[PDB]
Amino acid sequence: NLDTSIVVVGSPDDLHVQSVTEGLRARGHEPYVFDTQRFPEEMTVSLGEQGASIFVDGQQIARPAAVYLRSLYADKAMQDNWRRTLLAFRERSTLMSAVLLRWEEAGTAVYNSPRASANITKPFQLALLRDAGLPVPRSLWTNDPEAVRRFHAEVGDCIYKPVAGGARTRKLEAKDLEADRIERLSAAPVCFQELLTGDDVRVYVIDDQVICALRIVTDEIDFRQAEERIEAIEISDEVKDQCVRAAKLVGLRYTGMDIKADGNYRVLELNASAMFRGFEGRANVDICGPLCDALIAQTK
Amino acid sequence: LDTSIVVVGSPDDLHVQSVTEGLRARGHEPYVFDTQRFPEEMTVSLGEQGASIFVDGQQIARPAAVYLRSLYDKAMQDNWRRTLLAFRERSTLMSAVLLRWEEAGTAVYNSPRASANITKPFQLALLRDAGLPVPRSLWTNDPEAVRRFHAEVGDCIYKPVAGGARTRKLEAKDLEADRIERLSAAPVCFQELLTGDDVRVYVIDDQVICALRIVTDEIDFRQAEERIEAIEISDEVKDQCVRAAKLVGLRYTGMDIKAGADGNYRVLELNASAMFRGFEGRANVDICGPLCDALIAQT
């Protein structure tokens, strides 16, 4: 706690916070856990005008060497007064974000900075990769019923999902193209993508080093219950650099790329905080290891 | 439509009004992008490649220069968890439009990427670390921190961390535990009470447009009005303001600054979408002009 060189931002109850904290302890580095979730009520943060004047529970933390950013963060208070509650959350979150922005400015290697949030915007992240020579699904974010009917008339079998996440993907069928609900794009835009058929592959990239590429297939084992099987795989070096270009162009140090397979893969999303324990166990592959490696590197 | 100069805001906005009428006075009709009417009365379509941006069928892949003025009740009281998600979907699409343009090479006059460096607890640190004078400040939820700050600094003020309320002066009743201990609900910004003259410096593309002193005069019973009159600043200060605008990453900027007890300036804040109409008049400065000229210069 007096050695704030490596900071893990997140709750000690979070599994990945535990995994990274332990995997670092095993290498002789006891990280500082910045439990943001408990900030205003049971922790103090104080900022001076000088960038270095950052104080957490009285202790100064001007510039960590590296930060693993898992999360920054009884809400019936919203059901009471939404406006006050929103402004208060904004005060909270502004202070925390300022802490992390100051660390990045001072020179801390934040593993996925909160700046990349801009370049993670789905409709922009895709266009970013696409206009850089990367394969992506024929996509379409719209609020026009007619626009999507031409999208359908062109690409045929396709699906729809939320623009910013918040619901599981649903296959677009003809009853959705009905004037009953296709007019409801009036209330909010929707993402429509072509229906890719090949396999789901996930590629971890940590500081311009493809750590692995894992296949995720499913086996149906019970009534409406299926389980994933992860398989360590090797990838064309062309794509083991095509990926690295995506990570560096979006601005992520540690990323989990999501590709889906024609018979050749296309990039769907880069994840600014992908989990790993699921894959770490379903294919006995190591990701926490290289993450801790990259973290302890910045201390030298 | 000639989508080389786009003005994002509502035609009812007096500022987009000024900018559009100035651009017209110079041989360009902008495409006003009234984004209030996004969900309902307007269609936007984005494809996988960045050029495929369509507003009402008409595509707008790459303007020369954007002037961003804004990007934008009971539906909340009823169901709040879905209202927020709906607003976020609309907002994400609009922001993707703006980011795509900037990535093409559009001169977005103040991009939304600035909203990062805009946050006061980081912007003041940026300016302070670059050697520019900022006021002594403390952003905190720590009553002991506030007590030490008040003792160190003297007269203080407190304002929200991200704005939203009139700043008030710190009094002893506020340091009483009754009030002070409410800092556990959300943090607060405390600052030294600067006691000088309000000054505002306008900067477009690393050129200082003018510097205006803002005073107030009592015209009616408990009613004041602002008098905004021009002053001259040294080339020293002019270069500092240009550097501050560049540090925060803004093209059009109205810098709020202020003398203190010493008659020397402190940058208070840099606005990412400052107004200018109330300033141009009595000062006989023209800001709308230089802004429109800078816009046309990108075409």
Partner: peptide, 6 residues
Amino acid sequence: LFIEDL
């Protein structure tokens, strides 16, 4: 809240 005007 502390800022009573929010």
